């Protein structure tokens, strides 16, 4: 069965990419824009933006390898390895023209290498709500005067003995609500039903493992990006971040200025990590305006 409701005018489909069967939801007409979700979620986080973008663009929203309805990767979970799959998927649908890319959270980790390595293929770029993996992330505090930090999960998820799978198995719904709401300012939008849907998807045993394998590969992605970042990004770029509890604040744009020559940024007040759901109206407006200019 489909894990999430598909909007009218969109199709749920699959494509084999380098031996890995990727799930995506596609609709609209025109130049291609690919939307890439992040941790704890699936293509469905984009379901409010997709019909609006589909008025002017062909829109494709894949499930990351191992998450949603996509098969796990065959190579590995580092950013360079996963970006191969996403690049080839986008190029199957836009072989003769560059495409636009919008990415959220670890979607950034899993697309940055193919952006920097195939710059001619990317017309415009939108990155929101996560650091590109580099040594800046080693400075985030573990514990705060406000209590539980927003980043202690980096170490928990990365632990090489699969501690996270071991402890969260059987408690997937409790943990996901904790994680999502503690990174949200607008907690109201995360209803019992929405959390149930996301929890069922990432509780699939291979998806729970895949979720944390992205973090187990994070230091490898850092090492990869230290080489890749010697070439700066030249296409027009926009960053978005939440300015409320749970967000990246000014860090998103400040980091991106070290990676991109042509970058504008926005911080959305009263919004946390989950921008498409917490602050859909202003976020959708910014993304559509940036891509439509």
């Amino acid at each position, epitope marked *: 069965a489909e894990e999430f409701p598909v909007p009218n005018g969109f199709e749920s489909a699959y494509r084999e990419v380098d031996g890995v069967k990727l799930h995506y939801v596609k609709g609209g007409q025109g130049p291609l824009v690919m939307l890439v979700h992040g941790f704890g979620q699936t293509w469905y986080e984009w379901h409010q933006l997709m019909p609006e973008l589909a008025k002017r663009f062909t829109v494709i929203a894949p499930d990351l390898p191992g998450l949603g309805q996509s098969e796990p990767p065959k190579t590995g979970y580092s950013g360079e390895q996963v970006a191969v799959y996403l690049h080839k998927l986008a190029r199957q649908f836009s072989p003769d023209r560059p495409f636009d890319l919008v990415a959220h959270d670890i979607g950034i980790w899993n697309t940055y290498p193919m952006v920097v390595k195939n710059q001619a293929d990317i017309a415009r770029l939108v990155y929101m709500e996560a650091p590109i993996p580099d040594a800046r992330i080693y400075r985030f505090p573990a514990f705060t005067a406000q*209590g539980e930090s*927003l980043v202690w999960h980096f170490s928990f998820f990365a632990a090489d003995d699969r501690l996270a799978e071991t402890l969260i198995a059987g408690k997937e719904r409790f943990f996901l609500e904790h994680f999502i709401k503690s990174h949200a*300012s607008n907690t109201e939008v995360f209803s019992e039903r929405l959390l149930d849907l996301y929890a069922r998807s990432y509780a699939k045993p291979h998806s729970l493992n895949a979720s944390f394998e992205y973090y187990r590969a994070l230091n490898e992605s850092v090492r990869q990006n230290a080489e890749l970042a010697k070439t700066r990004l030249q296409m027009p770029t926009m960053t978005l971040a939440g300015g409320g*509890h749970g967000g990246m*604040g000014t860090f998103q744009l400040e980091q991106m200025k070290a990676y991109a020559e042509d970058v504008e940024g926005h911080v959305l007040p009263g919004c946390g990590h989950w921008l498409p759901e917490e602050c859909a109206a202003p976020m959708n407006r910014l993304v559509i305006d940036f891509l439509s200019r």
Partner: nanobody
Amino acid sequence: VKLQESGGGLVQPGESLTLSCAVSVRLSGITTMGWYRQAPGKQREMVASISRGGSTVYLDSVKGRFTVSRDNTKNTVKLQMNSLKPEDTAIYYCNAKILLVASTDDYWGQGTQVTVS
């Protein structure tokens, strides 16, 4: 993010006051709201704070007398001050802390004078 306190004034011992703080962003986007007071020449003290989940911290000498609360409908924070005493005279400030990934944001209102005489 902008905060504006109101509700201060001059009262006699044993009376009550209600301070309120208006917040320009969604209140659940504020990790901690803390009421601070400052009397002339004294060290500032944290009177009452409330996390967005509702955990409270109170200055010992106001426990049982003061109560801090959040009103997510009106998007305000309140400090109910009962059994006021001369020791409570001070300027009262509201402080908003916003926990982010790399740092914690810090915002303040301009304050309101409370005088118990």
